[PDB]
PDB file of N, CA and C and ligand atoms in Angstrom:
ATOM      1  N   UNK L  27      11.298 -72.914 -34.490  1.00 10.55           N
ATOM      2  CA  UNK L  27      10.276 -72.117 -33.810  1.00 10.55           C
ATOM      3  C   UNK L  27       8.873 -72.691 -34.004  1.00 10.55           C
ATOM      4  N   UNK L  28       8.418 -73.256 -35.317  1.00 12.08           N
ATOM      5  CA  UNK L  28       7.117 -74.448 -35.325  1.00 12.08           C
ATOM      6  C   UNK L  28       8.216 -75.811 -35.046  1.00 12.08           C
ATOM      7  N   UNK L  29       9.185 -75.759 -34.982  1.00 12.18           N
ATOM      8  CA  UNK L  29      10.248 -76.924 -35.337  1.00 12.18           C
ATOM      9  C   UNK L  29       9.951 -77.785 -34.560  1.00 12.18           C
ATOM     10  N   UNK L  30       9.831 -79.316 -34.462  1.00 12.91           N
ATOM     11  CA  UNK L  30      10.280 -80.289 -33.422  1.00 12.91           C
ATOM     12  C   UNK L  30      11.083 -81.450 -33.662  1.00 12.91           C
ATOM     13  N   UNK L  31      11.818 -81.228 -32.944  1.00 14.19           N
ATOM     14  CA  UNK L  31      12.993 -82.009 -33.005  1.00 14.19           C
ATOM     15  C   UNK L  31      13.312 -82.981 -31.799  1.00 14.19           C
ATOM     16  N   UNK L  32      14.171 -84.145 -32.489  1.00 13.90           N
ATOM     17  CA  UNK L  32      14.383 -85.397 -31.907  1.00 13.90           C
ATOM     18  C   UNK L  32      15.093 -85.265 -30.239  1.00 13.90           C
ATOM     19  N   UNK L  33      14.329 -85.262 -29.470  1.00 16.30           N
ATOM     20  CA  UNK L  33      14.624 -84.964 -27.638  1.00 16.30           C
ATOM     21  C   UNK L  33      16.071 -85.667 -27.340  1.00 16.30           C
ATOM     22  N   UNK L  34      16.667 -86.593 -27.795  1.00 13.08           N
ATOM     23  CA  UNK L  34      17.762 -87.614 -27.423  1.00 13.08           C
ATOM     24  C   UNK L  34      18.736 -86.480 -27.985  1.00 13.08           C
ATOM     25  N   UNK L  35      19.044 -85.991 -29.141  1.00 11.36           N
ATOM     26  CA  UNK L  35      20.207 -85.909 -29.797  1.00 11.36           C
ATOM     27  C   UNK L  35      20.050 -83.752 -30.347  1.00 11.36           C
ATOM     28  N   UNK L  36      19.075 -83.648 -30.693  1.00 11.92           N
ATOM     29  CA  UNK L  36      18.498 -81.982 -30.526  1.00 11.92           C
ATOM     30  C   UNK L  36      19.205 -81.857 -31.803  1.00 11.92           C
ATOM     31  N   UNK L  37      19.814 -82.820 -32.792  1.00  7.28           N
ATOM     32  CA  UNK L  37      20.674 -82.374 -34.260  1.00  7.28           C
ATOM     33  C   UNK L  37      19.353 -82.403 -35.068  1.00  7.28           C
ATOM     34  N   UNK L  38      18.271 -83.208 -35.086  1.00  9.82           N
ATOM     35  CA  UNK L  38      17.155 -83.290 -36.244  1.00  9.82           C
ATOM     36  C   UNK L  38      15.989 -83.304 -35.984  1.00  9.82           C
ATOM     37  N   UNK L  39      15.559 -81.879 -36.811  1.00 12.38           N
ATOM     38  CA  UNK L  39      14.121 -81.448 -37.063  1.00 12.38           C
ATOM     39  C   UNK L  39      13.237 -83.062 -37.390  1.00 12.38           C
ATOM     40  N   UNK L  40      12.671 -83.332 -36.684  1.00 10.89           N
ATOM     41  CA  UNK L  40      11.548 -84.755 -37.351  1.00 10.89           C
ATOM     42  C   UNK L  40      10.257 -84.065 -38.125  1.00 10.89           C
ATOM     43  N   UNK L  41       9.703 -82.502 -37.203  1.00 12.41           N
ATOM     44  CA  UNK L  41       8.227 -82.079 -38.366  1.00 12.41           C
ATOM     45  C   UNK L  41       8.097 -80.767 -37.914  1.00 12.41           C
ATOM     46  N   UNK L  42       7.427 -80.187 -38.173  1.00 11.51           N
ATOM     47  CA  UNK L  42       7.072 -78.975 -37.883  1.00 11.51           C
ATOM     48  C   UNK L  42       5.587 -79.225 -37.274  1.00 11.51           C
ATOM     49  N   UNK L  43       4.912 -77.720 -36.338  1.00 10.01           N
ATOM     50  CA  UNK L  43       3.901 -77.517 -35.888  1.00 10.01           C
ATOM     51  C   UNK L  43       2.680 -77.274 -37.216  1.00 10.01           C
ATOM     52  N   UNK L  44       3.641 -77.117 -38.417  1.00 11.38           N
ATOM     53  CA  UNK L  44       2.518 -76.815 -39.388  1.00 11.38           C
ATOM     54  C   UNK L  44       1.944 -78.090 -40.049  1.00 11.38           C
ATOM     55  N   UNK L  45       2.754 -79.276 -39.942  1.00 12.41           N
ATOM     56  CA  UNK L  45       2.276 -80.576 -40.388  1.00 12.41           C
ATOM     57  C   UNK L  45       1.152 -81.117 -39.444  1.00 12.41           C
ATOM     58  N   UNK L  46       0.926 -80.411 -38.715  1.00 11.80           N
ATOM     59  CA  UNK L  46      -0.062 -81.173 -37.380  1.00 11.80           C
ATOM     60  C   UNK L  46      -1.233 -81.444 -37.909  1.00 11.80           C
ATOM     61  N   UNK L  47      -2.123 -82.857 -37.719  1.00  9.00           N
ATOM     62  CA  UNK L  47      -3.668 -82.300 -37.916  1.00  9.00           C
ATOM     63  C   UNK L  47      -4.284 -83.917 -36.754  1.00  9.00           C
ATOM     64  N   UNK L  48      -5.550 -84.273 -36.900  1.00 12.79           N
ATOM     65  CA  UNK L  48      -6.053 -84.766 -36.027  1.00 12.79           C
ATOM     66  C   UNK L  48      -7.099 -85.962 -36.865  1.00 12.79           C
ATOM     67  N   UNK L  49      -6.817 -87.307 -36.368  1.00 15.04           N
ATOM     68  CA  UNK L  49      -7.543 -88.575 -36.634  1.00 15.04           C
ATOM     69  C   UNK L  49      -8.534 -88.193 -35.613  1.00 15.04           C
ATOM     70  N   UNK L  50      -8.383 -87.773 -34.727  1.00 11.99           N
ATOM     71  CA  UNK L  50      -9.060 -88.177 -33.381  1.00 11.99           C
ATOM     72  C   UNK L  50     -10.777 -87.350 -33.944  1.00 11.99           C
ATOM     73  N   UNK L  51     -11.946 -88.715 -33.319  1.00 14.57           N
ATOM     74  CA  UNK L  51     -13.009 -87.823 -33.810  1.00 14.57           C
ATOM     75  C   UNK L  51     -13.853 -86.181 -32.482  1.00 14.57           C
ATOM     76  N   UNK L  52     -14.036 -85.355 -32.858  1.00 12.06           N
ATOM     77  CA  UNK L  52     -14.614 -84.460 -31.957  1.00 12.06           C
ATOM     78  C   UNK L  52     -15.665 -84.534 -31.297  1.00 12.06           C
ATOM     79  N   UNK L  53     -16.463 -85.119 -31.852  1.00 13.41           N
ATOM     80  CA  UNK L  53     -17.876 -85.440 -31.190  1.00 13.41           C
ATOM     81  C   UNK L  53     -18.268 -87.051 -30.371  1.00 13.41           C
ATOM     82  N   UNK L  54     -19.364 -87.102 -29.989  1.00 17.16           N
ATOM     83  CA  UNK L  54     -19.600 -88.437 -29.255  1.00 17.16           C
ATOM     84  C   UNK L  54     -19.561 -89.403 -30.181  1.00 17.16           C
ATOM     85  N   UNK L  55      -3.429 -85.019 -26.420  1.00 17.73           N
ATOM     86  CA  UNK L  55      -3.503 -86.572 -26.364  1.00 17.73           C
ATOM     87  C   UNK L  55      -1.710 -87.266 -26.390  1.00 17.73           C
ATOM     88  N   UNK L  56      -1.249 -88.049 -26.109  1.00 18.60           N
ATOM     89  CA  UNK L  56      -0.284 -88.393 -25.930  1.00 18.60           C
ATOM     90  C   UNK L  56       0.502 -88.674 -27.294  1.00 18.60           C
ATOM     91  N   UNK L  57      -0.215 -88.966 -28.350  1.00 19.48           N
ATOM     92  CA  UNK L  57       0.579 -89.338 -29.773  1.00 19.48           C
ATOM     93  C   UNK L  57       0.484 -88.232 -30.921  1.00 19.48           C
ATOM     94  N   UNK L  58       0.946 -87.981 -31.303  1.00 18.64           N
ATOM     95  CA  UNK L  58       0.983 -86.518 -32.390  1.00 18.64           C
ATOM     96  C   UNK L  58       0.909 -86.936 -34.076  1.00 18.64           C
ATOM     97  N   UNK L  59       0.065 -86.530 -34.180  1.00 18.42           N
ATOM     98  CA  UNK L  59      -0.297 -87.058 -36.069  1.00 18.42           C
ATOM     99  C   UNK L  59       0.143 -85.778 -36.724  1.00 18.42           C
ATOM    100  N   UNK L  60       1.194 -86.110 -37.323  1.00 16.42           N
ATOM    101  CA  UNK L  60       1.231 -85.082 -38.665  1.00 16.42           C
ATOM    102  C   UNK L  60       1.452 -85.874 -40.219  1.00 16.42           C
ATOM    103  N   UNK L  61       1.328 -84.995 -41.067  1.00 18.53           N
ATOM    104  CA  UNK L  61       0.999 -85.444 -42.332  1.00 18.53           C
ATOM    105  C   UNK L  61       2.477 -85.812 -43.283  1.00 18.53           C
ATOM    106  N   UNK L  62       3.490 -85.285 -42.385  1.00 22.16           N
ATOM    107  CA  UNK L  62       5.039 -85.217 -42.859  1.00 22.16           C
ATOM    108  C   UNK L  62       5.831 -85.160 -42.031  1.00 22.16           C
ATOM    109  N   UNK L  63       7.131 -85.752 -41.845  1.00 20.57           N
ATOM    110  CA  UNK L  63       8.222 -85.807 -41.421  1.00 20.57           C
ATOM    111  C   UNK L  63       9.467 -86.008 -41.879  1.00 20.57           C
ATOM    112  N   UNK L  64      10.491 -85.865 -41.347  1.00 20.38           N
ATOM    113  CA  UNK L  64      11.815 -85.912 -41.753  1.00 20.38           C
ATOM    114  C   UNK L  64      12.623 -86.406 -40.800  1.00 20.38           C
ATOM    115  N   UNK L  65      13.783 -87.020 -41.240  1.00 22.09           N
ATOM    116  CA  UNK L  65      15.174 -87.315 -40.379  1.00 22.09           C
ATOM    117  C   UNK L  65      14.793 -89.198 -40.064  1.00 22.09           C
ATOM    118  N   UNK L  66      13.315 -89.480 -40.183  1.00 21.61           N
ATOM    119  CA  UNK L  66      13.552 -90.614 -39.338  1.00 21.61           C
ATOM    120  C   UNK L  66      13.784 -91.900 -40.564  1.00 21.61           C
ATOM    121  N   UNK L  67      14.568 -92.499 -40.280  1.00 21.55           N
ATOM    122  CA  UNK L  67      14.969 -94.359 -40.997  1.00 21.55           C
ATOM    123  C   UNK L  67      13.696 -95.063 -40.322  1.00 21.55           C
ATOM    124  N   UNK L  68      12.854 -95.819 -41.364  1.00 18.51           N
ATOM    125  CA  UNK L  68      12.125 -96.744 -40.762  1.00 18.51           C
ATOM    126  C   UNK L  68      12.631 -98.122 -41.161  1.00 18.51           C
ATOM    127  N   UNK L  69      12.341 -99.283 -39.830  1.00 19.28           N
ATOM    128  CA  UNK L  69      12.471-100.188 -39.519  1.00 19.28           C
ATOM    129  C   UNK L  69      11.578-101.871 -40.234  1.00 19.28           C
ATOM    130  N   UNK L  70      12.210-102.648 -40.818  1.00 17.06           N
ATOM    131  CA  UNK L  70      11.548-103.608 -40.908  1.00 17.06           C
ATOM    132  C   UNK L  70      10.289-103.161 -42.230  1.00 17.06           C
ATOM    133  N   UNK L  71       9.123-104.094 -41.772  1.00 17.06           N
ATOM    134  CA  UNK L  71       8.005-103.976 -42.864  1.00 17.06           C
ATOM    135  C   UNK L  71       6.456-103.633 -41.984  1.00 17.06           C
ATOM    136  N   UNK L  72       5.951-103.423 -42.751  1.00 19.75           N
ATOM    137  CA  UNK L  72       4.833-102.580 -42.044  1.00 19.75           C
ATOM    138  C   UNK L  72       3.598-103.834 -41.870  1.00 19.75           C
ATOM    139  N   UNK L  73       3.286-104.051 -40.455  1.00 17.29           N
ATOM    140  CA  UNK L  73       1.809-104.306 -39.638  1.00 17.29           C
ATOM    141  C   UNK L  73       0.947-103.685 -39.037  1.00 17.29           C
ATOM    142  N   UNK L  74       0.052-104.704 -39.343  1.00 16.11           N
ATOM    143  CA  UNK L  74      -1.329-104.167 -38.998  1.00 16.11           C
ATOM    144  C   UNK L  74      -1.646-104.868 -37.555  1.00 16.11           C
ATOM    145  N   UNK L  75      -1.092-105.232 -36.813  1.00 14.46           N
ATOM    146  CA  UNK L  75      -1.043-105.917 -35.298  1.00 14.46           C
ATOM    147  C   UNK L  75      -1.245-105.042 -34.349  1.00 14.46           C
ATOM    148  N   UNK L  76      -2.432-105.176 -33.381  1.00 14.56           N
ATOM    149  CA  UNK L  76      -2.417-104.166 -32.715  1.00 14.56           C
ATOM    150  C   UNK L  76      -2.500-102.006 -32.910  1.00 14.56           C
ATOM    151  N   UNK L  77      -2.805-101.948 -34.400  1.00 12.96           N
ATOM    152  CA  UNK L  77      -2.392-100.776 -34.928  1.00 12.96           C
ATOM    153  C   UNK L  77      -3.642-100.095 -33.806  1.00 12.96           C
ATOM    154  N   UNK L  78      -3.043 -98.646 -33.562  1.00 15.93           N
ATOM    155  CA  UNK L  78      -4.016 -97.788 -32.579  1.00 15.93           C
ATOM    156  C   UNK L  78      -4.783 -97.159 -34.201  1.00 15.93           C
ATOM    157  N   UNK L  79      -4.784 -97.059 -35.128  1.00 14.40           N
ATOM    158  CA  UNK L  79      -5.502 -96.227 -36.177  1.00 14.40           C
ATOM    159  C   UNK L  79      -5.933 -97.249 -37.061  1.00 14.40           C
ATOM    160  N   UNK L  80      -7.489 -97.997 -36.536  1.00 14.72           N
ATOM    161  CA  UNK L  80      -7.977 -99.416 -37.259  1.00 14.72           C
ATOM    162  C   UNK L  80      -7.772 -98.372 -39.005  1.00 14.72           C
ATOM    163  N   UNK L  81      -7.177 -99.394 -39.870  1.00 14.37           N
ATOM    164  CA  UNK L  81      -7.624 -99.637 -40.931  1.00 14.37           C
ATOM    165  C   UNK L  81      -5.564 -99.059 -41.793  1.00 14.37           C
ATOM    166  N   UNK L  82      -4.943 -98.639 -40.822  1.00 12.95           N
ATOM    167  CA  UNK L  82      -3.474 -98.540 -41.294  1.00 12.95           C
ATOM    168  C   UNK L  82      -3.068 -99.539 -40.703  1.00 12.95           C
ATOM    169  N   UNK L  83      -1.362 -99.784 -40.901  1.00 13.94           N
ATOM    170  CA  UNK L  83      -0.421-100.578 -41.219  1.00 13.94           C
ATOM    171  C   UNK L  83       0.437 -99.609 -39.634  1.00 13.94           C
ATOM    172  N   UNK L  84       1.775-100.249 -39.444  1.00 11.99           N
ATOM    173  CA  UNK L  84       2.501 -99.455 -38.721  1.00 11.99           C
ATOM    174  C   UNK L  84       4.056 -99.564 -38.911  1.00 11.99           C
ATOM    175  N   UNK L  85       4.670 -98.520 -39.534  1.00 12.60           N
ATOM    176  CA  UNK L  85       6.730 -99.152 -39.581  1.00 12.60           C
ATOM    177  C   UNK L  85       7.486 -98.629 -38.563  1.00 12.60           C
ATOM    178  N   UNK L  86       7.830 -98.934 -37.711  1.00 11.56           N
ATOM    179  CA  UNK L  86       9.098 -98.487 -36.587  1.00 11.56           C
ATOM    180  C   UNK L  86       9.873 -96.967 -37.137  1.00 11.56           C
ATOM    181  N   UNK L  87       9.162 -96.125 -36.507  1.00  6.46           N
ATOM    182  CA  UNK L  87       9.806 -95.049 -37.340  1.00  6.46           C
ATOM    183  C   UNK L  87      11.455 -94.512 -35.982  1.00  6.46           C
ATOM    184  N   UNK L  88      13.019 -94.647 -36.616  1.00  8.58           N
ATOM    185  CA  UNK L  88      13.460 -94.052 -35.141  1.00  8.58           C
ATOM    186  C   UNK L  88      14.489 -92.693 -36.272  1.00  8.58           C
ATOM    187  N   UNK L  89      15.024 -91.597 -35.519  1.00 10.80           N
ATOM    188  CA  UNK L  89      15.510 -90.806 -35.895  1.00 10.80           C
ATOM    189  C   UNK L  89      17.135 -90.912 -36.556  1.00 10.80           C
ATOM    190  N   UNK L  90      17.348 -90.677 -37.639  1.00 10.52           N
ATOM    191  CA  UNK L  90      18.383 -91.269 -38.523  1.00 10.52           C
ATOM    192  C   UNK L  90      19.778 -91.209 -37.815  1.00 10.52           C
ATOM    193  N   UNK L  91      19.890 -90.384 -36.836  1.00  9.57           N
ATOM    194  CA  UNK L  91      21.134 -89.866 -36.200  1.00  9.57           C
ATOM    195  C   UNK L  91      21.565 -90.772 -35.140  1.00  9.57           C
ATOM    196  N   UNK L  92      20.880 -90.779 -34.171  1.00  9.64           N
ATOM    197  CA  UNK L  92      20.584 -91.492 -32.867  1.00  9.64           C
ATOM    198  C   UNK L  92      19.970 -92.566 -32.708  1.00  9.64           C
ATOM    199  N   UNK L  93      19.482 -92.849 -33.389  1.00  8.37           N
ATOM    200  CA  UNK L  93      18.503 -94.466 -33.456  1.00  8.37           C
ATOM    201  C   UNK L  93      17.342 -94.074 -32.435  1.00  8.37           C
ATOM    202  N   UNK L  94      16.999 -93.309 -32.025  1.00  6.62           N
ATOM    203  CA  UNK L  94      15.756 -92.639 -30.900  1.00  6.62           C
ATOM    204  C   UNK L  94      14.690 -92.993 -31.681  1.00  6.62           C
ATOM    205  N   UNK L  95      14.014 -94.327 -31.149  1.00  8.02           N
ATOM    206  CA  UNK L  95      12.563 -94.521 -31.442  1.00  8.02           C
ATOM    207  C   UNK L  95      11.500 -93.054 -31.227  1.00  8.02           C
ATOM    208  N   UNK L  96      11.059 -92.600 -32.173  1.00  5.24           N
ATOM    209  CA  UNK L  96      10.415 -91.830 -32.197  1.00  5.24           C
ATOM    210  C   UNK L  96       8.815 -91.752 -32.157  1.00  5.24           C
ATOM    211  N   UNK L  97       8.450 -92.426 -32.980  1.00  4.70           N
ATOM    212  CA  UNK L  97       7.066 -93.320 -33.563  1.00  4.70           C
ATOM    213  C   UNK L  97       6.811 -93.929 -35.036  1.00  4.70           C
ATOM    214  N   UNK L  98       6.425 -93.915 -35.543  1.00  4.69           N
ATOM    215  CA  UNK L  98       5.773 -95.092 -36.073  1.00  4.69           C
ATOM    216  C   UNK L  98       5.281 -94.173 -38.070  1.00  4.69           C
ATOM    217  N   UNK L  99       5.222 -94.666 -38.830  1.00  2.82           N
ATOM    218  CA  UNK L  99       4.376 -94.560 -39.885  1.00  2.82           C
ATOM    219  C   UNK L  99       3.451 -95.229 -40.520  1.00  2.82           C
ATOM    220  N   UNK L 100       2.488 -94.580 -40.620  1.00  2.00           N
ATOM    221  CA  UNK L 100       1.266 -95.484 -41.047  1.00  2.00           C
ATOM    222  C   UNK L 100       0.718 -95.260 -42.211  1.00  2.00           C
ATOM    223  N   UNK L 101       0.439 -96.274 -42.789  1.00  2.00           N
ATOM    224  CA  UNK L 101       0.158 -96.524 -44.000  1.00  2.00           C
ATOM    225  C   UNK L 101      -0.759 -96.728 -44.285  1.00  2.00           C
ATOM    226  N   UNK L 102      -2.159 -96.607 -44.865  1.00  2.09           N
ATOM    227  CA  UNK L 102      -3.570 -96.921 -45.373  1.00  2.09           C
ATOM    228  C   UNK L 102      -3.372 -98.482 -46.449  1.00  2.09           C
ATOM    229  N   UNK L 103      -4.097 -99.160 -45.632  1.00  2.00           N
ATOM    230  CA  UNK L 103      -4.623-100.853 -46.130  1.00  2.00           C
ATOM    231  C   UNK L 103      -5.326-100.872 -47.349  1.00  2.00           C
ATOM    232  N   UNK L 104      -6.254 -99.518 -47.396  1.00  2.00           N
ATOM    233  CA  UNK L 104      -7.096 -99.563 -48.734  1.00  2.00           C
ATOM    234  C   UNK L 104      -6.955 -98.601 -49.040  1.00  2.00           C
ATOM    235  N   UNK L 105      -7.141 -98.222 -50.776  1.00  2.00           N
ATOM    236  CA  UNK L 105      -7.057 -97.091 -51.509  1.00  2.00           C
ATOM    237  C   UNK L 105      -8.002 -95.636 -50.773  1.00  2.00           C
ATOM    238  N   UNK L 106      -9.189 -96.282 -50.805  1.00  3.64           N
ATOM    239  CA  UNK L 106      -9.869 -95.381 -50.555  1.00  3.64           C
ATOM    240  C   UNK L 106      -9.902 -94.123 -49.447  1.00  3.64           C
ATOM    241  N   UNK L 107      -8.898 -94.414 -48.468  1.00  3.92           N
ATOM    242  CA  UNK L 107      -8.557 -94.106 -47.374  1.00  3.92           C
ATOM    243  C   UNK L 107      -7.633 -92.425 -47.646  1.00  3.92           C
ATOM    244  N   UNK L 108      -8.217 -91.776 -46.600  1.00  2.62           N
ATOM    245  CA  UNK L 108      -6.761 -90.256 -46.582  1.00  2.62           C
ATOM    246  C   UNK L 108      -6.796 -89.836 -45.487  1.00  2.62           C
ATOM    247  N   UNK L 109      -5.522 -89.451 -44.695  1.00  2.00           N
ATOM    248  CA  UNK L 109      -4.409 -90.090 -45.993  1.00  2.00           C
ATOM    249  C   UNK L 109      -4.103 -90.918 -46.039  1.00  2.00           C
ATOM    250  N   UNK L 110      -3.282 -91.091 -47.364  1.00  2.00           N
ATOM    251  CA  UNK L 110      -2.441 -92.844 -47.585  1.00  2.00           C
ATOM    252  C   UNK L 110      -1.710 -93.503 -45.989  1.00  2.00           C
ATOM    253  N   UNK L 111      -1.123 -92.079 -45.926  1.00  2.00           N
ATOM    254  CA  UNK L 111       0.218 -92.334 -44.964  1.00  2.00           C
ATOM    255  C   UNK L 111       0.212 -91.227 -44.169  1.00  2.00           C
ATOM    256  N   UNK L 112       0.705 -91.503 -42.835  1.00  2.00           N
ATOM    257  CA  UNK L 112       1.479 -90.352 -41.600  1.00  2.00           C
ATOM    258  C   UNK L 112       1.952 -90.509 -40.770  1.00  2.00           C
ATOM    259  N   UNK L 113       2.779 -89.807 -39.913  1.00  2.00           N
ATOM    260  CA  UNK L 113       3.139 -90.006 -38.944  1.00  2.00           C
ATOM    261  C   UNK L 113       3.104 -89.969 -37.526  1.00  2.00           C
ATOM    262  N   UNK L 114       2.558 -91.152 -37.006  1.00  2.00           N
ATOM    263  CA  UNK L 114       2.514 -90.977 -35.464  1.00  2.00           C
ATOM    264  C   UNK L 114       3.792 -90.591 -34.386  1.00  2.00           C
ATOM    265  N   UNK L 115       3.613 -89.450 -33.928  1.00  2.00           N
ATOM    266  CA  UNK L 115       4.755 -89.395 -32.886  1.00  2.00           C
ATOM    267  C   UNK L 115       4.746 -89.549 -31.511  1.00  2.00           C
ATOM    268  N   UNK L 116       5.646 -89.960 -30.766  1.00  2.00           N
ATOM    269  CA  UNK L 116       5.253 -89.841 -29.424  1.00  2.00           C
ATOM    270  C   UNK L 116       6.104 -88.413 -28.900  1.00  2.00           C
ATOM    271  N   UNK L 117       4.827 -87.614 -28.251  1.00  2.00           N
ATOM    272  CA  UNK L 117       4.997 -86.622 -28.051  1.00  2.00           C
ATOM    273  C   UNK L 117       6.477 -86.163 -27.539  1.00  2.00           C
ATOM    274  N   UNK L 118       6.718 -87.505 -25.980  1.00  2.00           N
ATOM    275  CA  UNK L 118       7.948 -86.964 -24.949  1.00  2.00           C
ATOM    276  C   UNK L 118       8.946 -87.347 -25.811  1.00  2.00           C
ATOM    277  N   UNK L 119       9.323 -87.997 -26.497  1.00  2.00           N
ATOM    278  CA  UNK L 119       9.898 -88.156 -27.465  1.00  2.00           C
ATOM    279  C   UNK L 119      10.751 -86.557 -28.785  1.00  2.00           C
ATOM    280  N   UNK L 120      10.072 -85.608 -28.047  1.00  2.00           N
ATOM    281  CA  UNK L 120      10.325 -84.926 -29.032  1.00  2.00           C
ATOM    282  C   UNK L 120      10.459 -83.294 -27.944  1.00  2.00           C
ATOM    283  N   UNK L 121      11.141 -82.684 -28.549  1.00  2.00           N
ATOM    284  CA  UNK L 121      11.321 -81.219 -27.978  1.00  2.00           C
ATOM    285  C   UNK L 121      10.794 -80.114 -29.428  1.00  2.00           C
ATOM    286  N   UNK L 122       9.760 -78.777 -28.695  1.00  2.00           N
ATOM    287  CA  UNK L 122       9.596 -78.777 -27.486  1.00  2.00           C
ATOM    288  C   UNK L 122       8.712 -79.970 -26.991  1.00  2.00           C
TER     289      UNK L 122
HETATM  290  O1  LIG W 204      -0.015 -98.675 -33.809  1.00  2.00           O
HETATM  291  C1  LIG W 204       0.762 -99.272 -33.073  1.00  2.00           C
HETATM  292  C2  LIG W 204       2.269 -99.195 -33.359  1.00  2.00           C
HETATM  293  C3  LIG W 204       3.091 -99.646 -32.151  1.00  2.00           C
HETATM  294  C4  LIG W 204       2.478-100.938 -31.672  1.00  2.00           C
HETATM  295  N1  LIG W 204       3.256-101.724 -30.708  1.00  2.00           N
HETATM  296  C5  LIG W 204       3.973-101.362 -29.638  1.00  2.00           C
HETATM  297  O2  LIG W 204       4.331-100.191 -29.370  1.00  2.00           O
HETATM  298  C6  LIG W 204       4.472-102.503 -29.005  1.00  2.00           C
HETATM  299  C7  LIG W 204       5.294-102.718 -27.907  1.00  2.00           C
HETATM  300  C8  LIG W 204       5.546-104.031 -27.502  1.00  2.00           C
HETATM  301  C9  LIG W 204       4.970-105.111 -28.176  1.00  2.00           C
HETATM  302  C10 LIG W 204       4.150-104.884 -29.276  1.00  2.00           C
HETATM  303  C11 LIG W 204       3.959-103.581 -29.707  1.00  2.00           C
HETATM  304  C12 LIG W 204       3.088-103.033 -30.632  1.00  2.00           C
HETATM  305  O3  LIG W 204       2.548-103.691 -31.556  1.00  2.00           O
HETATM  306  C13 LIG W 204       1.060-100.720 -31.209  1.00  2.00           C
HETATM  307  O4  LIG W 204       0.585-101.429 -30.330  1.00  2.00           O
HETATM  308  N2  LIG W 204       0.260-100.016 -32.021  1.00  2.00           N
HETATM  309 ZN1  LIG W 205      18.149 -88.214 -32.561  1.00  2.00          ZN
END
């Protein structure tokens, strides 16, 4: 009911509506940032190539069941940074 779950396969919760929060700045969207997730296996090792969030890393995040690329986890390059880590989702990717 906050639940969202993996659109391909509908067996695994990936986060809830309560993990939600926002990189994006307010003053002078298609990808979903939350602070936690579940169900997904990530892929390979984490780059910084092209990353949409300058100053993280990015790992192939797909859903453990189905292999459904989901999005991505990102990782902070420097300490100083918060958070360390989160998860980008792609929205259509996910039900509701
Ligand atoms: O933060 C990111 C993670 C995903 C990443 N990405 C693609 O989705 C993608 C698709 C095809 C070639 C290269 C990439 C690429 O680096 C991208 O461009 N930015
Ligand atoms: Zn799935």
């Amino acid at each position: 009911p906050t639940s969202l779950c993996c659109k391909q396969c509908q067996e695994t919760e990936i986060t809830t509506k309560n993990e939600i929060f926002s990189l994006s700045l307010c003053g002078p969207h298609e990808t979903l940032t939350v602070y936690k997730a579940s169900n997904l296996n990530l892929i390979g090792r984490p780059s910084t190539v092209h990353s949409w969030f300058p100053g993280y890393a990015w790992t192939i995040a797909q859903c453990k069941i189905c292999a459904s690329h989901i999005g991505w986890k990102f990782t902070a390059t420097k300490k100083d940074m918060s958070p360390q880590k989160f998860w980008g989702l792609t929205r259509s990717a996910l039900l509701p």
